[model samples]
Target chain A: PTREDLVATAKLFIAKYNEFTPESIISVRTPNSVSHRLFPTRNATRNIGESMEACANAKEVFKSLTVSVIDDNDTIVDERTRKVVFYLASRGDTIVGEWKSECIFIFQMSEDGKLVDRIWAGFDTAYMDEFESRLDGI
Target chain B: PTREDLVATAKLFIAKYNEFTPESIISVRTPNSVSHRLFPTRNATRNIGESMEACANAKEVFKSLTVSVIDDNDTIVDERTRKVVFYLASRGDTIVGEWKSECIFIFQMSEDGKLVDRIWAGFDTAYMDEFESRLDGIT
Candidate 1:
């Protein structure tokens, strides 16, 4: 695939991500896709089913959630490596309060260049701690 | 510069990084280079002098510290963008315990291709929290 084609796939993945549903989010990922939450305390790797379950769980906790790319310049697409990295900011209206945080998402493309094969995610731990505290309260 | 040239610089920077001295770490970076700790709660950006001080402080807490690239395949270099990213693992023996964590280091090279201009670092926060707890024991 060309550089533009891989980048377009990345863009499409993000577009599907914003749809904020388990099915929508997984639409751009391969069946055997794996997500590695880089900074997690434990259980960092999530498979397709686990990831979809996480989306469902997030939907239950947050009244609304939206994550978007911080800037176009922050997006790095390497066609040769079949990788794309983006800096993103997420805003959510949870049941308890509002949440905002910044994160990094690195997408590894599949061989066919139509779906994401692996995802490396790094998120703001401070916000994650706060979000977990709120969940504990519930 | 060529892709190999940029990759060479990145490799040199990591070699210097393993030297574990403030001066050695800063040697490969431009004078006005800035480092951003991407996952920090506060004080994310650090200048050269501040970064040196951080190295000094780490030396005081850890009796020995070593960080190395996990794999050659994990190192990504984009010659056109003058950017490189590496997955690294660190092992440190502190006053109280041993600490190990994985991190990602993204380097943005200077236009001249001789030095690093910017650094974005992401570390394992779980270990950071544990390290802080060990520090609080002294005070």
Candidate 2:
């Protein structure tokens, strides 16, 4: 798919995810990944069924979650992997604390361009300070 | 330095790094890093001395390391930070095996135009499969 098409698809997924995201679980990973667990054992998510099951729990903890893709700043899309990086303002409520935070989503599009894969969560979490007031008492 | 100058500095750093990389450490981090440890931490590098030690180990285990900043692609130079991102092909030999690898180098230059403040090493390890034949039997 072209770059424009990929961007549109990403926007839609974030929208759908926000609408359905539960606050019970915090992972947005696909059933294909085993490396996203907090403990991250090698075969942790080897069961795609188990991985898929986590999605429902995720929606319960997060509320009013939504994101938008912003360019014109540090956002960059690397053509090599079709991995696009842009500012993602995560506007929502959370079970853990105050909702609404800023994040950047760095992910790639599926081969046929129907799904999102490989969200780079590590780098985006840095913007949490600006995204939400967060907490300092911890 | 201007954008062009920062780019030149990054190219030079990678070029020098290639000539001296040691397979001893798998980290592509700068000699300037603190410590990205493994004893259950908050993911921040601690103890700058811990960083200097990594530099000592990286120089002995690899050889003839060279990388070219070819974009034939996206070579992003963030104006705000003087950090650059581009495709870098690492050429060298490891105690573990043959060496040729493709990775992205995201590095920032100092305000004075000399040392590198940091370099991004994640997300690019996937290209290792294509960059080298790799020897994993171990010594």
Candidate 3:
């Protein structure tokens, strides 16, 4: 797929994710979590449904606006597979100071092709701490 | 550290694990993971200390004499961090036709450099079926 194609898919998923509820996201994409949550909430859901629900609930988390979306550069869209390996930081956010890099997110597309399995790889609490300032806003 | 040293560390952790309770294992290394017990179980625990306790309860679930350990060719001892990523298979009386090549076990070293963190990476119930037959013995 073209770079635009991948970015477009990322946007689509991101829109659906940020706009919808937990159950809506779980409507199709179940997760196969290997590490903790995107921002090191320090917990991992066991199965596909539960993980999806956690991510869905994450929609309401304090720092919900930019919770690990791979809609930018330095992110790789596996040409052969639908996996997007994104480095989360303050990238392309209209909000000021949103261009900082924090953690790594590896999102693998489901068999039929949809963002589902996400490994919040490189889950360092130090990086997770970056989002603490945004907590009071929640 | 030498491969022998890493291997020794793996064995030491394994010995402590197979021969003890979950509390014994987590007496020190309370990992920040949520899932089934360190050794694959039919049910996955939801959090940290609880998972360890579940494993402790597992002592009565299985024959302690034949617990699964990283005693296989696929078992690797991370030279730097002191973690053993072992792929369990038929070793001792644990089982004659032990599970193979599929399930991956990533056991992290405790703060004191013991294999106590015990993270069971890539845990899938589909994969756990390999040992379903042995479930009766533990029960």
Candidate 4:
């Protein structure tokens, strides 16, 4: 009884789940009254939302912004989860060479699209140039 | 001139000094007629002598015991310093393992005949067995 639409929906689910963040929370609801919780508490939810918002806004200023996600074993689960966003505010060329912030967000989603897990998020910028080099083409 | 006799004398000196125990005190006399204190004091001497005598008597009961002079790092220094004396109480099928004390005497000899730098002695049947196995022809 599976249709092409179902396949497309699964693919979309995978993609969205892969890209799910605090700012871009994917909401899904079925006819059944099954309860789901993205975060256990409101504080965690707000914290993630704020972080994603900051990162999204900072991305506008730095064209070379990137975000990366890593798992507990320090393995980069999602390459795109690694990103750097920063702004260099200088009236003149004051010879300032280091002004950048890198951010990494890791999230997980349940199979039934009911629960979302935020593993970790780190905000720092030391290897901004390298980050840009990695995204040279993409 | 260092002759064979001198070398032998030197070897004795080495053995005596190397195998120093609190007992068997050996004093060194300088050419100036002054005696230099080298061996252990009277109390240490008595203690070492008593310990050695006990070990010697225990050797009759335990047949397989080993003793070796070990350095601070527990490394065996001299093979000659390794000794095991055991005494066997029962010989045949009626063999009831009676308590036989074992003793090992290990000593570190000094270059001079004046002192035994270090001495260690103990008796353990299990350790002796292991040591016997380790040697090529310990049986």
DockQ of 3: 0.03
Chain A TM-score (model 4): 0.28
Off by over 4 Å in 1: B40-43
Worst 10 residues of 4 chain A by lDDT: A83-92
Candidates arranged by lDDT, highest first:
1, 2, 3, 4
Best candidate, TM-score-wise? 1
Which candidate number would show the highest lDDT if scored against the true structure?
1
Error of 4 at B68 (Å): 48
List the candidates' TM-scores in order: 0.92, 0.44, 0.34, 0.19
Candidate 4 lDDT by residue in tens digits, A1-138: 122222233234334533444233333212222212111121133344454575465444443322222222222121122111111111111123233332323233233333333232222212332334444644
Among these predictions, the greatest DockQ belongs to 1
DockQ ranking of the models: 1, 2, 3, 4
Docking class of 4: incorrect
User: What is the alpha-carbon lDDT of model 4 when measured against the actual structure?
Assistant: 0.29
RMSD, every candidate, angstroms: 1.9, 11.3, 14.5, 32.0
Q: Which ten residues in a row have the lowest lDDT in candidate 3 chain B?
A: B34-43
Which of the two candidates, 2 or 4, achieves a greater lDDT against the reference?
A: 2
Segments in model 3 whose C-alpha atoms lie over 4 Å from true places: A1-138, B1-3, B27-48, B68-73, B90-103, B110-112, B121-124, B127-139
Q: What C-alpha lDDT do the candidate models reach, one value each?
A: 0.81, 0.49, 0.46, 0.29
Q: In model 2 chain B, which range of ten residues has the least summed lDDT? A: B34-43
- Backbone clash total for model 2 is 19
